[PDB]
Symmetry: C3
Subunit: 720 residues, 3 copies
């Protein structure tokens, strides 16, 4: 039986989309041919800049809209998965899963969130013998270790209750802090008393964790000391040996009822001065290696500290996707939609960004699947190591490619997984410690062409692209529940820095060896449409360079040039109308089949314009500088502020200059002012919030100042 | 109202009186009817949308341009 | 205080408790309460507030909670378990 079904659009919303987009393309082509041939506009430089920027925009739009072609939907059947693979009455036949969590430093983000996500990971609905959690830290701080030690006991207390009462979400903080009616569909007779007792226990655990956090802020001069009375190996961050610890495993503690709990492995890498270590690529790769030694699981589910498991069915749905002999053979990873919480009614920041995750991601799903984003992905272990799809499409060589350790090579040689020796666990711990050595990745192909693609800043998309170029296929599953919910940035500086980082990473990937324009061209195994989508995703920031000039055009056209383009009733106006109606009808029809709110598209496009104005511009300039070689939010806001002021002063001055005329601008003034109004309306709402205390009411004083300044300009014009 | 509104503009300011009377009755009907239809087809009553305003003004240009051309 | 009917004695009791629960040596701080209405309701409210303060002062002074007014403290939606390290606080 088919465990999952993939059905396309019902065709009642797809053929009209195709027809309308083709009509839009034809109209654009005719428009550009007519613009190139007939009009001159009496000015060469201005018209040339306008036409070249418009042509660049047209190329960008045509190369961006095609990937949306052929959207596809999917659904999974956990009932049939359990009916077949569970095999009630006989031992389970479900594949193992290795969850990964990585932390950088406990001071920047409180360890409470890390503990909450660890608990959510440890409280999934999967056989305890299969799921295994791994936690890695780069700071090697004792605060995180103590927090995990306490979280072990709290999980021992919490897991039976959660697994018995089927409560969700599994994260204790994010569950207890819910105003939804907790007694909605619970039939367990003794639920209330257990809930009250568990809430009290959780508050006590919170108090203990807060005490540990407060204590950690004071650093003794002798250095940290453990309870057993031994100096902390991770005293100096730069220099410290790597350490591996096991908790809540078969060897360790057990549940109150006597049932075992999933093993949690705490790994800290070995770092030395003068040794180059990557921010996160060298941590996840080390996690993969140490997991390959400890518990060889065919599937590795990657996550972040902020994001936790919402519903205890994501693992089961991933197994459903990846277990089918037909639709589970060529699958490499199952990307999940990362949804956020804590959103106000006025989502001016547009941090949600679901138009991309729904309209675009699903559209790309049809051809070759989505792109790795950095959270909620079940990678295939063999795919991560690099072997190519099964049934496509020497020992020294194995040493060179994988590493000097022979134990890791022997472990990875097994397709099914698991530990072949199944003995000498302490020796396996020592072997893992050796495998996580600093000098392991010296001349091997680790990261370069095997693991997380080493990159200066951004590597998730690079790794996904590299592993797709080999013939792999990825899936995109959207459960009814998000299943992966995480806290999102709430201020503007963090969002601007994040978008700037994304743009810088994209520019670096474009300028690096792995450039889609001339990479992955041997042996095929990459769809042309997928390559086009990759090009779109890589060279999207470059549109900012023409966008800045284009949005600057109206300010000059309304003051110096005082013209846009001659208007002809027969053909020019008709083409303008065709384009204007086609774009809006296309947007509406696209929104029809995606279930997106109309305001969301407008909010996203204005946010994109803002990012192009400032974030992409600065990122691309920094990219040029870095390539030639071989920032504060206030500085980042200089281009937007300059454009806003220049546009507003230009529009007001030109309005006064047109008023002084004898009603000879009845057409051209409206034509010139419409573009300026469009730009200003897209730009002002963003600047108002950052320079305003609230978005509900900007102010009333600024209106007074604006009217008084208009009076000032009018009086000056009258007097001079 | 929009079609007749434009048809009044083409005239030489001869509808200064008649146009307001005819428009006022239409405005009374629309103002009563519009708020209800907005909510059922809109996601919130606090802010209807900003896109429809863009479409309406662009649609206003649509009729105006057509009238000038025809 | 002027009269207990115009303003409830609960607010006066809360203010008295906040005054009595300051961070200062007990031998120095001294509180004085005056009334113009000479009403017995205020006197009885103060008598009960004496016992309530006897109960409340050690807890507040030991756990360094703020604000000291109980009515204006218990009715706070801010996370009450934010930076408290005392094991037996709950
Ligand atoms: O989400 C996390 C993930 O993000 C990755 O970076 C993504 C980013 O997340 C996306 O938001 C972003 O999507 C934008 C596209 O980059 C951008 O190319 C596109 O530009 C469109 C624009 O949206 C659209 O409005 C515009 O329409 C105009 C026409 O072009 C004009 O011809 C016409 O006149 O007027 C209409 C507007 O009315 O066209 C342009 C394209 O030409 O907008 C998208 C947002 O809506 O893409 C980024 C990557 O591509 C990041 O890489 C990941 O690491 C991260 O995990």
């Amino acid at each position: 039986e088919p465990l999952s079904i993939v059905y396309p659009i019902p065709r009642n919303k797809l053929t009209p989309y195709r027809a309308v987009i083709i009509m839009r393309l034809i109209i654009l082509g005719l428009f550009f041919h007519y613009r190139i041939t007939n009009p001159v506009d009496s000015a060469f430089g201005l018209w040339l800049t306008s036409v070249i920027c418009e042509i660049w925009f047209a190329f960008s739009w045509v190369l961006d809209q095609f990937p949306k072609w052929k959207p596809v939907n999917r659904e999974t059947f956990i009932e049939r998965l359990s009916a077949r693979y569970e095999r009630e009455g006989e031992p389970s036949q479900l594949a193992a899963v290795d969850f990964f969590v990585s932390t950088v430093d406990p001071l920047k983000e409180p360890p409470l969130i890390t503990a909450n996500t660890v608990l959510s990971i440890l409280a999934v609905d999967y056989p305890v013998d299969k799921v295994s959690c791994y936690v890695s830290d780069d700071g090697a701080a004792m605060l995180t270790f103590e927090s995990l030690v306490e979280t072990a006991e709290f999980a021992r207390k919490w897991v039976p209750f959660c697994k018995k009462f089927s409560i969700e979400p599994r994260a204790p903080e994010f569950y207890f802090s819910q105003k939804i009616d907790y007694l909605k569909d619970k039939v367990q007779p003794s639920f209330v008393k257990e809930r009250r007792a568990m809430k009290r226990d959780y508050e006590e655990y919170k108090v203990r964790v807060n005490a540990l956090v407060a204590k950690a802020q004071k650093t003794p001069d002798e250095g940290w000391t453990m309870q057993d009375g031994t100096p902390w190996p991770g005293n100096n961050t730069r220099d410290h040996p790597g350490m591996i610890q096991v908790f809540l495993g078969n060897t360790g503690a057990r549940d109150i009822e006597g049932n075992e709990l999933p093993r949690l492995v705490y790994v800290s890498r070995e770092k030395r001065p003068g040794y180059q270590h990557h921010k996160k690529a060298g941590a996840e790769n080390a996690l993969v290696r140490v997991s390959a030694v400890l518990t060889n699981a065919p599937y590795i589910l990657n996550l972040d500290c902020d994001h936790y498991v919402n519903n205890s069915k994501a693992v089961r749905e991933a197994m459903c996707i990846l277990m089918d002999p037909q639709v589970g053979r060529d699958v490499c990873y199952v990307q999940f939609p990362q949804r956020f919480d804590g959103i106000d009614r006025s989502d001016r920041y547009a941090n949600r960004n679901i138009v991309f995750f729904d309209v675009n991601m699903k559209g790309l799903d049809g051809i070759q699947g989505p792109m790795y984003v950095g959270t909620g992905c079940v990678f295939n272990r063999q795919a991560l190591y690099g072997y190519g799809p099964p049934s496509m499409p020497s020992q020294l060589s194995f040493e060179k490619t994988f590493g000097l350790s022979p134990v890791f090579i022997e472990s990875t040689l097994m397709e099914n997984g698991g530990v072949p020796e199944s003995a000498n666990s302490s020796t396996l711990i020592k072997e893992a410690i050796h495998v996580i050595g600093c000098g392991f990745e010296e001349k091997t192909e680790w990261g370069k062409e095997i693991g997380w693609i080493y990159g200066s800043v951004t590597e998730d998309i690079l790794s996904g692209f590299k592993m797709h170029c080999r013939g792999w296929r990825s899936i995109y599953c959207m459960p009814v529940r998000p299943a992966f919910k995480g806290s999102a940035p709430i201020n503007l500086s963090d969002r601007l820095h994040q978008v700037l980082r994304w743009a810088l990473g994209s520019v670096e990937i474009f300028f690096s060896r792995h450039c889609p324009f001339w990479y992955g061209y041997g042996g095929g195994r990459l769809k042309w449409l997928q390559r086009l989508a990759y090009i779109n995703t890589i060279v999207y920031p470059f549109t900012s360079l023409p966008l800045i000039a284009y949005c600057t055009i109206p300010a000059v056209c309304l003051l110096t040039g005082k013209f846009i383009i001659p208007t002809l009733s027969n053909l020019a106006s008709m083409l303008f109308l065709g384009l204007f109606i086609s774009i809006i009808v296309t947007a509406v029809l696209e929104l029809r089949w995606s279930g997106v709110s109309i305001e969301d598209l407008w909010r996203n496009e204005q946010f994109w314009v803002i990012g192009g104005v400032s974030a992409h511009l600065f990122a691309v300039f920094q990219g040029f500088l870095k390539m030639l070689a071989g920032v504060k939010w206030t500085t980042l806001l200089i281009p937007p502020t300059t454009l806003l002021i220049i546009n507003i002063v230009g529009v007001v001055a030109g309005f006064s200059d047109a008023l002084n005329k004898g009603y000879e601008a009845w057409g051209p003034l409206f034509g010139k002012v419409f573009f300026a109004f469009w730009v200003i309306l897209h730009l002002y709402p963003f600047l108002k919030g950052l320079m305003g205390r609230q978005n509900r009411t900007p102010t009333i004083v600024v209106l007074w100042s604006v009217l008084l300044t208009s009076v000032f300009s009018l009086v000056w014009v009258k007097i001079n």
